Design a protein around this ligand. Structure first.
Ligand SMILES: *Cc1c(COP(=O)(O)O)cnc(C)c1O
Ligand SMILES: *Cc1c(COP(=O)(O)O)cnc(C)c1O
Ligand SMILES: [Cs+]
Ligand SMILES: [Cs+]
Ligand SMILES: [Cs+]
Ligand SMILES: [Cs+]
Lengths: 256, 389, 389, 256
């Protein structure tokens, strides 16, 4: 839970908005992934959002869907993901790590035992892509008991009763995705939601300064990072060197 | 929610947050619809006048000879479309119409659902896109044509294993964005609520008729009503009106496949554990670390890796019993219906029948009134039973 | 003879002397049968309970848009067997049973009759041999299997042109000797008397229903009832109960083929002269010196080189009119029914429909009540319309 | 009509029963057929029964059915058949010639015009294979008016009312095909039928003396002659030489 609250404090006191990369754990290989995350980080990544490989991503688009297939073919399992998360945490004590998840993988070993091993390897938050706020409670109590922030997606079609519920139940940050862009940020700060982080279409620095200026506490670049990895399939120096320069460009665009 | 999404612990709405306003509007509309006389009568008139309902209840003559079993067949194979898929698909396109929607999204594996959405949309002037997996599209060439013909747009999935599993996801992604113009027409009593309750209320007339027909003919309720369980609509369609007649058994047959002991089977409810997928908490076919796997059956329209929430629940309070039938037990019951009564049953429904033949051969002096749900005709299968035979 | 073999000059018993005791016993039996309540009720119960009668009468919704034509379809495509062949074949196997006969002889070209004799014999425990021409057997592989399956013995003719013409003869030779044990089950209202009168009285319920159904729905008799004329049973089945309602027209469609002007067609009644063949005096397709030739049509089950005696006769006193439809006019009406109403009609019945579409397109402000006899479904044809398209 | 009555008179006065070959006109060629009939005749044939090629022979078995196909392939027409019949009559004034027919070929040019050209080329009788005694009248009057005997088949299942009708309506000879063999011959002579000629299974001399002894006035060998022609397809000397010796063997077997 906590490391987020430390990140947003620090960024606030130095006029900065957070920039967060998403990437899939195990893509295109275990070895590869750990080098890719150490490059995202040193390039400027303020927090990480990782994906765990799951079968059908009812909440994800084609790029992430075959990104999961690339990690499956690598012979990545659940077990190798927790092993990866623990060493990422070993070389990096301060950075928040959150996880995109699907409810079958949480439930499969008991909801509590999953939040137990998350807390025990250092994961700060978990977003479970297909458990709506009204099917939240087993997952939400279990995260709180092992002091892991439950992240929720606040969607474009967000009615007001939702906005109250999300603000009351998430922690870490609110994932942002009718309603004027600015109007949502306003209502969430009214309702006392955790830091709203814009995730819809963040791929060029102009949008990061746009999100920061709008009152969003920063931005999550989903597909972009994955695509640079796809383009650079087997282009390894260009794979990382493009990634480095992209993250630092994105990051530069948030310190005002 | 206006209705309960749970049949005991099974069910739910385990969908991305964005689809939720779509599901809640569909619930609100179905509750209105079932309350409106106008909706019922228009729905009835299509069933009666376009599809051919009541379907017949045939007393078998020669298959139960020299046994004390009385077999009846509910003849959903004589429905327009030659497969029970037709009674829910009409009722859900009427609902889309009553909601002001103009498109229909749908997904398929074998073809029978895609074809049945296309024939309902042509009939009601709705635009229709079917999502079908490439593996399935290649194998199901005769059904692709029949869909195209009727004006349906067919999009070939070929991501993930390029099966129904994958087709089901892409169709929902499309629904996330289209949901105020389009309506997703889900193939069976499975997935997110309210599609479990809708797909049953629109297949419910099967039970309603079997009952009054057996009452007219035999003067007493059946002893057991058998029915296969691909994902549950035909079965739950038959069971529904008998569930409160505690004296009446309900057996649902599941694809034993090459054998329970061989894994290549589609029997989630009895030999596969609970999980969350396709927006519901219900039994399913998955690996030990939650990755869902493909099931298997000779009947394409019976292999789907989970089962309806309410079927998982009637098993738990012991109200219905679910059994298995292997592929070779399906084939033999196929040839036997043909050669004996002169009905070519669909390989799917042969699984329900093989089970009622086993029940009578094993205890020949037991007097017992059976009703199998013959749920599709076998014209589609005469090439496959002929690749085996 | 107990009944008249002649419809005006058409008809007769022009058979070898040896077959005559068989025909005279069959007449005597059919006259008894139609007089026996027991026979009627057993026949009725099979039609109702095994086959699915009454069939539906669908009001077309979208094909007559912005015209003053009202189309209804009589849905013999929703009959067990998906083709009207089923109502006479049940009634004639019941007759064989009532005569003490134990076998059924039959002949076929396309398959639909052979399959319908096999499904009736399986249902009543009669031995059944189908004679089918080799040309036809090779082409009709899906129907051979479906027959074999149901326990029918298939003998491959391949003498003469190895067509139905030839199959029809061999089956009678067999009947000459078998006639006191076996019964020849003639495919249509054609051939030696009494098969013209029997095959009509056993397809007559089509007319009986269309009438009460249009009376229930529209409150007035139809204006014309269209129907194709392969050899006449479906047509004479529809016409029969309307013939004395002088206000009601009866149009029968004949295979125009590639074109009347091209000879490859099956339109004997309007463009081929009288002759004696298959035991009747009726119009037929022959050369200038009496050698009968093969007709032609896109619909296999519509190409037969003569027509029923009573159809030849209703044309002569001007009570019915017979028209033509070419192959491409059949195809277009096929795609139009699919894409518009969502019914895949058989290519045979599309000929009757193409004619009623032409009638309404040509005079759009004429208010006129039509009823087409949809007489078989088109699952059989989706591969052939797909070899063209 | 008459030539039959002359044949049966002559045979009676010399203790003889008639033996009649059937063969198809135009088989396996026109030229061939005329040589085959002149050999049957000189070998001993007392009368001839010829077949005209027709499409489906509802009253004939497989041998004659493909015999018709052999003549069709020869390019034999109706017109070439009447031309053949006239020259057969030109070289042979005395021998009866009868024709097996199917009602479409009689009817096709008018029933009367067909019996007209029959009388005009010398045909003595016509049997129309598929016109039963109760559909006889147009064909029967027309034959009588051009003094051509209408031949009828008297079948195994012959009820007594039939036997009266056939005896009253045929001329030339009765074609014979429950009821004891001898009993039929008796009833026909009672009813005053024309000479009953046995046609069922006459293929070995023993049966010709059997038919003659039974009271049948002689016998018609259908398929046998055709088969010798089939066996000897293209064996021309053996074709005729077998035919010669067969007819004279059959014929020998009837002079007692
Ligand atoms: C599609 C199919 C089914 C499988 O699913 P249900 O949900 O049980 O109905 C059953 N029967 C037939 C004949 C089918 O085509
Ligand atoms: C066999 C067939 C016919 C042709 O003959 P009828 O004697 O006119 O009935 C007509 N319709 C269908 C659909 C057929 O299969
Ligand atoms: Cs019906
Ligand atoms: Cs299943
Ligand atoms: Cs019915
Ligand atoms: Cs015809």
């Amino acid at each position: 839970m906590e490391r987020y609250e430390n990140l947003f404090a620090q960024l606030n006191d130095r006029r900065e908005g957070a920039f967060v990369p998403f990437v899939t754990l195990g893509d295109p290989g275990i070895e590869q992934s750990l080098k890719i995350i150490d490059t995202l980080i040193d390039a400027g990544a303020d927090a990480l959002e990782l994906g765990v490989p799951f079968s059908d991503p009812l909440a994800d688009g084609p790029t992430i869907q075959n990104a999961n297939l690339r990690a499956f073919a690598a012979g990545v399992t659940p077990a190798q993901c927790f092993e990866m998360l623990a060493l990422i945490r070993e070389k990096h004590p301060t950075i928040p790590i959150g996880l995109l998840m699907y409810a079958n993988l949480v439930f499969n070993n008991g909801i509590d035992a999953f939040y137990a091993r998350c807390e025990q390897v250092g994961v700060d938050s978990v977003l479970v892509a297909d458990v709506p706020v009204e099917e939240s409670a087993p997952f939400r109590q279990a995260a709180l008991r092992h002091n892991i922030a439950p992240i929720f997606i606040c969607p474009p079609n967000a009615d007001d009763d939702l906005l109250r519920q999300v603000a009351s139940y998430g922690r870490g940050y609110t994932y942002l995705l009718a309603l004027p862009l600015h109007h949502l940020i306003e209502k969430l700060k009214e309702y006392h939601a955790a830091p709203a982080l814009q995730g819809f279409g963040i791929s060029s620095p102009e949008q990061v300064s746009a999100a920061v200026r709008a009152g969003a506490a920063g931005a999550i670049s989903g597909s972009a990072i994955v695509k640079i990895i796809e383009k650079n399939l087997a282009s390894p120096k260009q794979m990382l060197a493009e990634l480095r320069s992209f993250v630092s460009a994105m990051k530069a665009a948030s310190r005002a | 929610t206006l209705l309960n999404p749970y049949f005991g612990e099974f069910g739910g709405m385990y969908v991305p947050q964005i689809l939720m306003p779509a599901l809640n509007q569909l619930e609100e509309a179905f509750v209105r619809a079932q309350k409106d006389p106008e909706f019922q009568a228009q729905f009835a008139d299509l069933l009666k006048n376009y599809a051919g309902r009541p379907t017949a209840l045939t007393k078998c003559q020669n298959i139960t000879a020299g046994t004390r079993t009385t077999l009846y067949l509910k003849r959903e194979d004589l429905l327009h479309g030659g497969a029970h898929k037709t009674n829910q698909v009409l009722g859900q396109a009427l609902l889309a119409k009553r909601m002001g929607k103009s498109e229909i999204i749908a997904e398929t594996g074998a073809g029978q659902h895609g074809v049945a959405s296309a024939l309902a949309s042509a009939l009601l002037g709705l635009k229709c896109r079917i999502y079908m997996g490439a593996k399935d599209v290649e194998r199901q060439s005769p059904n692709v044509f029949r869909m195209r013909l009727m004006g349906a747009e067919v999009i070939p999935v070929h991501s993930g294993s390029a099966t129904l599993k994958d087709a089901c996801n892409e169709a929902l992604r499309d629904w996330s964005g289209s949901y105020e113009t389009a309506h997703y027409m889900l193939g069976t009593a499975a997935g997110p609520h309210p599609y479990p309750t809708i797909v049953r209320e629109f297949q419910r007339m099967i039970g309603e008729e079997t009952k009054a027909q057996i009452l007219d003919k035999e003067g007493r309720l059946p002893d057991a009503v058998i029915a296969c369980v691909g994902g549950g609509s035909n079965a739950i369609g038959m069971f529904a009106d008998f569930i409160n007649d505690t004296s009446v058994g309900l057996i649902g047959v599941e694809p034993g496949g090459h054998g329970i002991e061989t894994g290549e089977h589609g029997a989630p409810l009895k030999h596969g554990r609970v999980g969350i997928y396709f927006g519901m908490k219900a039994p399913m076919m998955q690996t030990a670390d939650g990755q869902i796997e493909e099931s298997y059956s000779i009947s394409a329209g019976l292999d789907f890796p989970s089962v309806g929430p309410q079927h998982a629940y009637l098993n738990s309070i012991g109200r219905a019993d679910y059994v298995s039938i292997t592929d070779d037990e399906a084939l033999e019951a196929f040839k036997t219906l043909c050669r004996h009564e002169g009905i070519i049953p669909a390989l799917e429904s042969s699984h329900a029948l093989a089970h009622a033949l086993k029940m009578m051969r094993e205890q020949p002096e037991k007097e017992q009134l059976l009703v199998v749900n013959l749920s599709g005709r076998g014209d589609k299968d005469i090439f496959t039973v002929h690749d085996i035979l």
